[PDB]
């Protein structure tokens, strides 16, 4: 009963007092508080999903089982909110594009520099041009 | 203690790094939120992710370019015995010995 007699009225008074002094942002008026010996419960639920999802890891290349459905059922069985847990189709496309975009720059930078370096060293006269550009000079 | 619990919880997400179904960023934020740490700045901003992508691209570009330049520059330095002498006179070395 000390949760109801002491803890909850303590939080209720503190919320209003900290709001009057602007030490906390104004609450949406739809915020309730439980005094729980909570967030740790949510963490425990999430940790179970990660371990259960890791059990699905060896079967990542399974052509038969719909792994996306199984992950959703596992998350539902735990009881966590599944809003945003599974990637949306446009999100998967964005990850699809980003992976290609990455080595596009990686091979692009590698290919650009090799040709740029090769053309810089094409002829000794052209090599002085690189020196005169960056501020270097041939005759030292 | 809160930070070390997040790292252990996040390290558990490493096996599913290539999972195409689960939004790992959402799980990472939820894990950090459940622990109770301040989430401001722990997640990379979109511009920061772009910068990291550029930096590793520039790492490969400069490193490949430095190798490609030196191989090409060495080839021109040893192209002819006359150009061979030019390299020595440049660095201060001498061909006559």
């Amino acid at each position: 009963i000390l949760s109801q007699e002491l803890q909850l009225p303590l939080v209720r008074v503190l919320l209003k007092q900290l709001q009057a002094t602007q030490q906390i942002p104004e609450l949406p008026k739809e915020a309730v508080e439980p005094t729980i010996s909570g967030r740790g419960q949510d963490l425990d639920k999430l940790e179970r999903c990660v371990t259960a999802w890791a059990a699905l890891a060896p079967m990542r290349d399974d052509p038969d089982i719909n792994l996306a459905m199984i992950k959703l059922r596992i998350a539902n069985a735990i009881g966590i909110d599944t809003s945003g847990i599974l990637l949306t189709e446009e999100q998967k496309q964005q990850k699809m594009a980003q992976q290609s975009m990455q080595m596009g720059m990686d091979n692009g930078a590698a290919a650009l520099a090799q040709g740029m370096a090769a053309q810089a060293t094409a002829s000794p006269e052209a090599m002085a041009a690189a020196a005169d550009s960056v501020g270097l000079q041939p005759g030292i | 203690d809160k930070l070390e619990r997040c790292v252990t919880a996040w390290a558990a997400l490493a096996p599913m790094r290539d999972d195409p179904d689960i939004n790992l960023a959402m799980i990472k934020l939820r894990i950090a939120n459940a622990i109770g740490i301040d989430t401001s700045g722990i997640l990379l901003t979109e511009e920061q992710k772009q910068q990291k992508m550029a930096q590793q691209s520039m790492q490969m570009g400069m490193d490949n370019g430095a190798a490609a330049l030196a191989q090409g520059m060495a080839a021109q330095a040893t192209a002819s015995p006359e150009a061979m002498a030019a390299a020595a006179d440049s660095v201060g070395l001498q061909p006559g010995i």
């Binding site: 090599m127 | 030196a70 021109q76 040893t78 030019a86 390299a87 020595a88 070395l93 061909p95």
Partner: peptide
């Protein structure tokens, strides 16, 4: 009329 690379193995110290 110049060559870029350092020459190291046999060149006279000069």
């Amino acid at each position: 009329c110049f060559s870029p690379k350092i020459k190291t193995p046999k060149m006279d110290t000069n």
